[PDB]
Symmetry: D2
Subunit: 363 residues, 4 copies
Amino acid sequence: PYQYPALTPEQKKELSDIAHRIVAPGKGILAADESTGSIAKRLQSIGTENTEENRRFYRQLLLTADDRVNPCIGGVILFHETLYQKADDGRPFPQVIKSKGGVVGIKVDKGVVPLAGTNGETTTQGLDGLSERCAQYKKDGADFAKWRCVLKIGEHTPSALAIMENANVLARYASICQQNGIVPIVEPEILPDGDHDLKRCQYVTEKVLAAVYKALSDHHIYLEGTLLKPNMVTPGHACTQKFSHEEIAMATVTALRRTVPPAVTGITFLSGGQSEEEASINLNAINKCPLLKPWALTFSYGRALQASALKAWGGKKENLKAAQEEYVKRALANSLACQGKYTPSGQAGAAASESLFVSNHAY
Amino acid sequence: PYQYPALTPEQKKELSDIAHRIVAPGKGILAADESTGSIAKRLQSIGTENTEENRRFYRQLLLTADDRVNPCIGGVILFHETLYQKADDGRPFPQVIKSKGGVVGIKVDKGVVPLAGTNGETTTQGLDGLSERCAQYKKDGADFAKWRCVLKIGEHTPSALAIMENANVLARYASICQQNGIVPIVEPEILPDGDHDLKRCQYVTEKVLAAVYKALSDHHIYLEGTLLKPNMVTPGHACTQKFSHEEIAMATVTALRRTVPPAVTGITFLSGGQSEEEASINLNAINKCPLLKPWALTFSYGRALQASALKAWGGKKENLKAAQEEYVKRALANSLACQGKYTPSGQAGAAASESLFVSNHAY
Amino acid sequence: PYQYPALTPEQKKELSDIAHRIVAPGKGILAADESTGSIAKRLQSIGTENTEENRRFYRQLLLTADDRVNPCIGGVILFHETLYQKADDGRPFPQVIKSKGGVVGIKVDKGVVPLAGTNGETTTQGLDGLSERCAQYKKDGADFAKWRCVLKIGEHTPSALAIMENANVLARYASICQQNGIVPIVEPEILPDGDHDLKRCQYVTEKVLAAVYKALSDHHIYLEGTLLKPNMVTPGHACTQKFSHEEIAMATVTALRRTVPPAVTGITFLSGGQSEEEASINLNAINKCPLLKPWALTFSYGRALQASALKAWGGKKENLKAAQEEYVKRALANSLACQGKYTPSGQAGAAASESLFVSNHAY
Amino acid sequence: PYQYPALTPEQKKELSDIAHRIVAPGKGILAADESTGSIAKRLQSIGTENTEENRRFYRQLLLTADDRVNPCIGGVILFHETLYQKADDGRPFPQVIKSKGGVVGIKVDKGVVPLAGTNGETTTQGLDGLSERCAQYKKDGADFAKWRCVLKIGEHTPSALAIMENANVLARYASICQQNGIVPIVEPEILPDGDHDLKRCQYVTEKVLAAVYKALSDHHIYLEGTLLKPNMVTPGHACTQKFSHEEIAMATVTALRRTVPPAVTGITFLSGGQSEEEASINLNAINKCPLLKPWALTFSYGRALQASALKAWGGKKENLKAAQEEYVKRALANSLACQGKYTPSGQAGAAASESLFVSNHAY
């Protein structure tokens, strides 16, 4: 083939630096990028109305937690709206995030759409005018993006077509962002739904990740200037067979070692329905795994960092402190987990948990 | 692989019928789908202002030509705007088109965007919410769509990446339309620019078309419910070597016979910068070619059906008749061409022409 | 991509001519290329010993049938051994075949080998020194070759890997033969085993053929200088649902029309276990099918042309005449079938049969 | 996709162990697998006759070097013939190799063959009955194999077709060996010929390696039970621009970090025409490179370990000692190089050399 560089050494340096800061040792990402539709089902759980102010107050609640949270959070994924909101102190949220030593990210996909002649499979859209949107977001302080593709395991679910099509769109999205100085987080999520065991998930995860990096290559994206946000290798939510945390940890790092090139700056796992505690224990075990792990293995959790905080808050402005405390707890635990230093459960074996939040999806 | 039908026998029948009527013997397509930006450079050639009324009047000029034009035009490709305009008689344009026995089409792509780490190569966007747009257009009377991808020949131009990426997006676009009862016209256009000869264009056209039908297959689209709008195989506009019309005709039908399955209802060629006359002569020779041609070989011209009409009109409402006459001339000639009955030049050999309209592109 | 011609116009002409003669109207191919292992199970059915002389006598029996057989047989596929044998009259068999207006072919693959990490799937080998072998066979009078790949339908049988791998090896084999002036018969056979219905076979056949022509394209083979030897689209041998001959005929020509380019000189079907009579009736119906069939639709049968002859012979030299008569019967019937003129059953509908010969395979 | 394991945990363990011993810290591989044709041009350089005894004596010369060589050589690649020869002491060569703590390997490909419609490109054959040959070699003491594919850089040389085809055959070869308990060394060699610079070689090497691991994945081979034998990233032999050893070292480990998964046990570089000394200095610098290198970076040299020894020997049995001394020198240097401990030149920068041996190829 032939060489026409996509990025200049200058643009390349820039992308590597951002990618590296987000995933610095002990750090992870807060994914607070629920669209108004999904946060609605959250706010609604605590009988609170889904109003812009309520959404703005809760995002603030999370984003203005005390400084114990600073060394733990490398980046925060925001929804478009929140990226233009302000804290009570009149500071735009990207400002409060940065001031606390965090990098701000923005979700840029426009949801999943059905794949015709498939068994309920899906791609995701959002490429139209993505370049323009990325240049603006860059101007407005965001340094990394998020695009989520969804795969599922069924009798004939991860259809090649889905694998090929999803891998290719992740590559297109990645290419566009890099051109605008935004570090793409590539999120090929294989859903925990179904009663498949550990090994079926590992096999499927390995086949999917292989396709994804080949696509990324074809499309010529600069790996060092990217993050990977896979699912951990776990049994299906309906599988009756039990597995320990090092069974899932071993399965996860193996799958990862066989597919993602060492040049990938880091992989930030999604929790997919796991309880806050269970999600921490698995991240820890992953980091305790004996095998050589050439990339940062950290977190990029949403509800796994938010369940207890939301529930503590319960819409009452009066519970702000108690809520923020619940979130800081989690942030600390996950900063420990992503270092294999998580003190409770989690350790080159384990098998604890207890909390729970999943739905026909996973997460 | 595994069977999950994309279309029902009912939806399949529907798509075949529409595809077949558009390309019935003696018929072709008027591509009158210039966006406001390109028609602007047209109107401007005849020192007329680019106003909605002027655009509406000129579209009307073409669309209300006398009934001699009815057996010649199977379909008309409209731009979004015109699809919602009315003729002086208060009739929506889709209505005047249909009443004259034509099927109305709508251009649905949102232009080309650069491919990073490529030599000025491009894909095209417009997939975002394409399903929704297609359902509406269907409601509003359109039965087929148009999406144009652009490839170019250079020292290293038709890069696989471009070929693969463009082929795949044509397949995605095709899949979505078929799901909404719209017959997709697949337009992989290889640009006439460069000083390449006949054979380089044939080779490249063969490689591109092969990729396109494989993609179409992977994506499971129903071929019978599609039209192909390729370029004819011609030397580059800058090639100093001369070729006869059967040299290009032979080169064109060969390239086509090696790549597009007989199940494809018909191929409607683009003129790409050829004069009205030259475009007619080549279409005719193509239809005079001795080889077995299992699909309709017809036209889907824009400026090759409009040059003389536009120039006759020259903005003066007074020249309406003289202008419409110029267009009807062309329509007749092309109805003859697509039957190998075109009486002037054009015939299993030929080499005439004379008119001219191309620019860094081709067309 | 880039142009480095594989074949010269001279080599191209040559390949087209051979391909066209084999499949001239009314003609088909006798596949008499059983290896010593399979003919052994044949000879053994009629309690005759598998000796070189017995094999040579029986091949002779077939190859020296009276002149009524001449306009019916365009080519004969021979096994390596027979290609070097002589008829009683001291004439090398390639000589008696040619003198009777037939083209001689040679099987050049070296059987199937297992595909690792697959459900009993297989490729086929024989590429090693294939070029050398082809140059010799060419010298020794053979003008076309045969290479058979085998695919099967199971809960997860036509695995992409098998499809991709088999398609690619067919392309490699095809490329080598064309370089040595031998017209490759490409044989992607999907086995009749399993209880799948008509539609599952059609879907699978369509997916396989699509892959095969894409591969062929990638590998740059000259289509016009090739023959295709697919399976007809039929239900599985274990399917309890009944289908008429036009159901299978319709299913077959549809599948074919969607996948193989009109440039392919002809498709010579394998019988795969069908009785001599049933095989004739299906070929006929196929040729009676109302749809446009741009290529020769003929036969390339083995046991479907030989069952009755072998059984008539029964090892006795005394029954030579009665045996040859049985074969000539079949040859005539199939010459009629491949013209849609087969007078008994077979006709744009039908549903007759009665004879039988299949085994864990199909054929 | 779907899970049908290729290897059992037992077979998997076995392959990992062998792979790991060959490439243990400080160890490398002696590639002494010249076919009779190439060793002939060697023996001939020192005006010695190419007789079985002369070939047997010289192989012995290398294989019976004193014990200083034992910790340095993890494996030895032998040609078929030598695998069945004996040392003067009546010991089969696989025995003397093993007794000295080495693993014996066997070259199993049958050379390169032209790719039709390509610019002098090539695949390699040797798959026919490869399984059988591998089972025998296993019985006869070999534990790893070698298969070499050759790619070249030209105006349009690394044609996709070549890349795809070569990658696929490496995967087929790898699959077969693993099934027979033999650790495949995968050798996609991009030839040093041409006047291309460092960056063109890096780009091409990155594109080739990406294709190779995707193929390997598709074919389901077990990475941990494999070795990679790439070329270092260097300018073309005809490039007039100069580069330092860390320029080539940096270029090499970057290219490697972007493409080969950390699960690959180790990469054993080929010298490709570099002098013994230059080859050592580059290996060292590679190991001195600041970047994270998750796999063993060692040597698998032929003439780069043999030049001086052969020349010292000069056919005279009398010079046995002086010759073996020259080889032991090199072995030691390379054991140091592959540890970044090579004491002369070589160090996170350098730019020395001086010796020379390349020909229209590279090596």
